[PDB]
Amino acid sequence: GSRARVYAEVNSLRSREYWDYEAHVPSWGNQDDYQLVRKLGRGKYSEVFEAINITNNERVVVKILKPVKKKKIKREVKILENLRGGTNIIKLIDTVKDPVSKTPALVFEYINNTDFKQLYQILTDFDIRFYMYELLKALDYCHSKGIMHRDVKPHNVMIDHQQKKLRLIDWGLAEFYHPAQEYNVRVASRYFKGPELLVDYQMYDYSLDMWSLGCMLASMIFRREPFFHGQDNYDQLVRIAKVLGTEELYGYLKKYHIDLDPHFNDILGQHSRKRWENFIHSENRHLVSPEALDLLDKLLRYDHQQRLTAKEAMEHPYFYPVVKEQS
Ligand SMILES: OCCCn1nnc2c(Br)c(Br)c(Br)c(Br)c21
Ligand SMILES: [Cl-]
Ligand SMILES: [Cl-]
Ligand code: NA
Structure with a gap:
């Protein structure tokens, strides 16, 4: 439900x-x-x-x-x-x-793409805001057109860093959203899979793409790419839970009546929710503002319903400098 x-x-x-x-x-x-x-x-x-x-x-x-x-x-x-x-x-x-x-x-x-592995170490604060805003335009558009991309990741985001052009590519996994429809959880790249996929919750929606978007934002502002680097789909959830917390995961599962594969019992452990400021250090400090952290906190949430929509994310103060420039 x-x-x-x-x-x-x-x-x-x-x-x-x-x-x-x-x-x-x-x-x-x-x-x-x-x-x-x-x-x-x-x-x-x-x-x-x-x-x-x-x-x-x-x-x-x-x-x-x-x-x-x-x-x-x-x-x-x-x-x-x-x-x-x-x-x-x-x-x-x-x-x-x-x-x-x-x-x-x-x-x-x-598109004359710069591979993300080079690019994501030389972006400025404004560049990250700009490219995330541009990507959000694509996601709000496809969501408004009733379509979930289901494979948002750097390899599917072409960025011409000279002309400042961004395109969301590879719509081969995209699907039409219909309320109450159950979807295959074997979508997205491991590192960009939302917790809903990792716990086999099939009644997902556009908000899956907003998790993936959040993963990209985290990798840019913190310079850790991919941000959640699981060894397999089970370990992927463990990596998430070591940040977002295990009790918080269990509350999400309880809310949606989600059954947890018992292989997780041996590997999740017990982890307190971490402050996002824990990821700041001298190499990324110039990219991390209060606004960036507030936005990220509202994207990288277990509860897919509570994540910001693409439009709500676009409206967040983090993007005010971009909106001002584009006006
Ligand atoms: O990360 C994928 C890099 C290779 N790749 N695969 N599909 C691509 C599309 Br469509 C465009 Br247009 C561009 Br330009 C590039 Br390059 C593409
Ligand atoms: Cl499907
Ligand atoms: Cl971590
Ligand atoms: Na599972």
Whole structure:
């Protein structure tokens, strides 16, 4: 018995065709217009190339989708089409197929990304506020469109640190939120999984992404990346509990009637909730204000309902310097 505090009924209030992705029929253009230039990465579901559209010389990124149920392809395509024009969401330029093999691929705008491992050690206080605000715009947008990203992490946040451009990428795990629906907890990267996933609570919502966002904020202001570095999914919860506290975890479980896998009994131990100021030291002190800590405390909460929404986070005083600059 849990529902999102925002955008709970937004899919219910739209035409079924909006969210019934299995019924979506994409228009597949011709991949022969694109010349692959360089491999940028590979995952379990895709490989990604920098490319050039030979008809107009536009530099793009082509994500060639590996064999999966056509259902997952339709889901990602329909989600991207629903997100068209959204602020700081990667722009889908076209949906194309190899005209012979019919292998599908997604064509995105190019971003000249700086890998987060370099970047996150040289950000200023203002830079962190700026990039977190930009990422929040993308999450508020997709949540408002009834979509949970479910894989927020640095590797899915492309940042051009020269042009100050940020895009949220890889919508292949994203889903439509419907109240009371049970979702697969095998989403997100280990380090960015919310406690709800780690305790097998399936009735989660957009607030999962706000946990992941909080993990990114913590890594930036404190310079510990990833912030919660579990060795496996069990140890991931232990790492969280050593900060947020074990009695506090048990109160969350009790509230939502969550059953705890008994393997945790041997590993959680007993831990008091820690003050966020404990993470400050000389190397990160210039990034950590009272506002940053207040915001972080309101994101990295066990209780998914009590976490700030993306909009509430955007409204927090931590971002006032950014809003003032963007006005
Ligand atoms: O962390 C992932 C790095 C490789 N990678 N994978 N998907 C990408 C998309 Br789409 C864009 Br656009 C850009 Br630029 C890059 Br690079 C991408
Ligand atoms: Cl699911
Ligand atoms: Cl710690
Ligand atoms: Na569990």
